[PDB]
Amino acid sequence: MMKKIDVKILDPRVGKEFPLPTYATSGSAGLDLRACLNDAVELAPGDTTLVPTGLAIHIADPSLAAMMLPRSGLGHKHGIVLGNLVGLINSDYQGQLMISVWNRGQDSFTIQPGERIAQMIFVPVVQAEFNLVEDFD
Amino acid sequence: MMKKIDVKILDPRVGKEFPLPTYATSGSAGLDLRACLNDAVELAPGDTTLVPTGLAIHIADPSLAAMMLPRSGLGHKHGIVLGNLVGLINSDYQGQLMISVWNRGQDSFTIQPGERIAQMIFVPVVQAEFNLVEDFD
Amino acid sequence: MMKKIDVKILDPRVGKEFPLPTYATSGSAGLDLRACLNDAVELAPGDTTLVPTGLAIHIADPSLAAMMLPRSGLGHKHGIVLGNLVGLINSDYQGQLMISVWNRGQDSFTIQPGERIAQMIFVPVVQAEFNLVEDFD
Ligand SMILES: O=c1ccn([C@H]2C[C@H](O)[C@@H](COP(=O)(O)OP(=O)(O)OP(=O)(O)O)O2)c(=O)[nH]1
Ligand SMILES: O=c1ccn([C@H]2C[C@H](O)[C@@H](COP(=O)(O)OP(=O)(O)OP(=O)(O)O)O2)c(=O)[nH]1
Ligand SMILES: O=c1ccn([C@H]2C[C@H](O)[C@@H](COP(=O)(O)OP(=O)(O)OP(=O)(O)O)O2)c(=O)[nH]1
Ligand SMILES: [Mg+2]
Ligand SMILES: [Mg+2]
Ligand SMILES: [Mg+2]
DSSP states (O other): OOEEEEEEEEEETTTBOOOEEEEEEEEEEEEEEEEEOOOOOOOOOOOOOEEEEEEEEEETTTEEEEEEOOOOHHHHHOEETTTSSSSSEEETTEEEEEEEEEEEEOEEEOOTTEEEEEEEEEEBBBBEEEESSEEEE | OEEEEEEESTTTTTTTBOOOOSSSSTTTEEEEOOOOOSOOEEEEEEEEEEEEEEEEEEEEOHHHHHHEEEHHHHHHHOOOEEETTTTEEOOOOSEEEEEEEOEEEEEEOEEEOOOOEEEEEEEEBBBBEEESSOOOO | EEEEEEHHHHTBTTTBBBBBOOETTOOOSEEEEEEEEEEEEETTTTTTEEOOOOOOOOOOTTTEEEEEEEHHHHHHHHEEEEETTEEOOOTTTTTTEEEEEESSSSSOEEETTTOOEEEEEEHHHOEEEEEEEOOOO
């Protein structure tokens, strides 16, 4: 299923020096997000840094959310994952998309400007209404 | 999409001193879960603690699951995430919802009673049946 | 919702000595994945190891992805989680399914051959097309 998502470019290098997020292939679940940075950021073991994307999206449909995830290679091989583990993006969020980058491993890592440092999937979400009961079936 | 989910209150403070989980806004993907605790729990760096919710849900529809996730602020800023990383709640689970709270950072943290310590999304899930093949297309 | 997923057995012990992944119950969201190993692997605190499944799947439908997650018991109780935190499996991926096993805790752990070391859910995914705007609504 396809959905057009409104995006506001906040940094003029996004779409230019830092390409807009893209699906690496046509069967790819996730779009790879790029670090919108002026200079490289050295992330020491155990440390977390907030990386700008230079963009804002507005999902708008409350039946939809996005989830930011590590990329497998960075996570597995380099211990470069998310400080919030999974980043949940609400349909009504219109701020800048930010990446909490966490070095969960033993080796210092250089986050380069423009690096595809995380990915994001769009998934349907269901809004629950609680029905109080004394017992289940 | 909307779904009524049966909930059993297990601790009588849930719905009273500890509010039932709620969507912070109407476009929010996740419901914030509250720590059903008698007293605050001090979580040292690197440590994990099992936090009760004082509630049980029964999703019941095998086309639906819930996923518990860190909240971004706690995860990023405080290193307060999940010890199981993501908590998957099965449609047929009827036990108490529990939160594995893990301090992945360097600073000791006080989990207060009633704190919105994690969030939960409901997502559709697909049940796979494997089709054995010698080769793909 | 149900979906047949093509699977290629890559190791002849899969489906024999190492059972194919299964839903523990009929309301279970996830299939438990087994470590296709010749011998046990001792995973020291803080270390990551790549575990084969001995199988390959081909989801094929770009409206579907899988997500690999820790199992709650291993994650919470033993600190045995995923080095990539969540493993996203793309619809067009046809390689061997691999598990990045990460010991996030303080105790050494033996990964036995055949152990149900992680689980996998199939979720619908939406492919986004960006619509550039100057302002949101
Ligand atoms: O990796 C992330 C995670 C979240 N967000 C944004 C989008 C999301 O809608 C908002 C709030 O996320 P969450 O609800 O997980 O964090 P919170 O701590 O509950 O903040 P709030 O009180 O605003 O809901 O932060 C990001 O930009 N990056
Ligand atoms: O953060 C969590 C994660 C899970 N659960 C409950 C709901 C879920 O349905 C059950 C089992 O979860 P999972 O299948 O991930 O753990 P397991 O180690 O495989 O236990 P089991 O053998 O019972 O399936 O534990 C929670 O209360 N909190
Ligand atoms: O735990 C995992 C995660 C991923 N994969 C496979 C399936 C997935 O389709 C592929 C690529 O995953 P991802 O896109 O997260 O990693 P990447 O670093 O971006 O590699 P690539 O550049 O190939 O997309 O790796 C696994 O076998 N196990
Ligand atoms: Mg990728
Ligand atoms: Mg929130
Ligand atoms: Mg299980």
